[PDB]
Amino acid sequence: ALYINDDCTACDACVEECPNEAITPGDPIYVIDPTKCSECVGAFDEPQCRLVCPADCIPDNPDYRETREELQEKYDRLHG
Template sequence: MALMITDDCINCDVCEPECPNEAISLGPEIYVIDPNKCTECVGHFDEPQCQQVCPVACIPLHPDWRESREQLMAKYERLTLAKAE
C-alpha cells in the first residue's frame, strides 16, 4: 500500500524532506503523497520515514492503493533506475 496524508495535517513541513522518493509535495491545502512514487520507504529504510517524523500521526496506509512488499520493491527499483538515467 502507498501512504496518504489526512486532513489532520498541520503543514509542519517535516515529512517532505524525509521522503527518499520525492513522493510528498504541498497540495492546495495540505501535503499530499503521490502513490505512484510512494514505496513506504521499502528499499531505503525499514519504516516509512514520514510516519516517523509526523508530529500528529496523520499518515496512514492508503486504503485504495494496495501493494505487496514485492510490488513496493519493484516500484523502488523502477524509481531508482529512472533517477539514474
C-alpha cells in the same frame, strides 16, 4: 502506498525524510503521489515520513494495498 489525512498541519517536516520525493507541499494539507510512494521499502525498514510527523496523519491508503514485492519494484523504477 500511504496518504495524508486532513489532520495534516502542513509543518513540512516530512519532505526531507522521503527518499522518493513522493510528498508535495499543499494547502491546507500535503499530498502523496501513490505512484512514487513505496512505503520506504527498498530504502528503509519503516516509512520515514511518519517518524517526524507530529499530527500522526499518514495512514495506509486502502486504495493501494500493495505487496512488498510490488513496492520493491516501484522503488527501482524510480532510482535504479
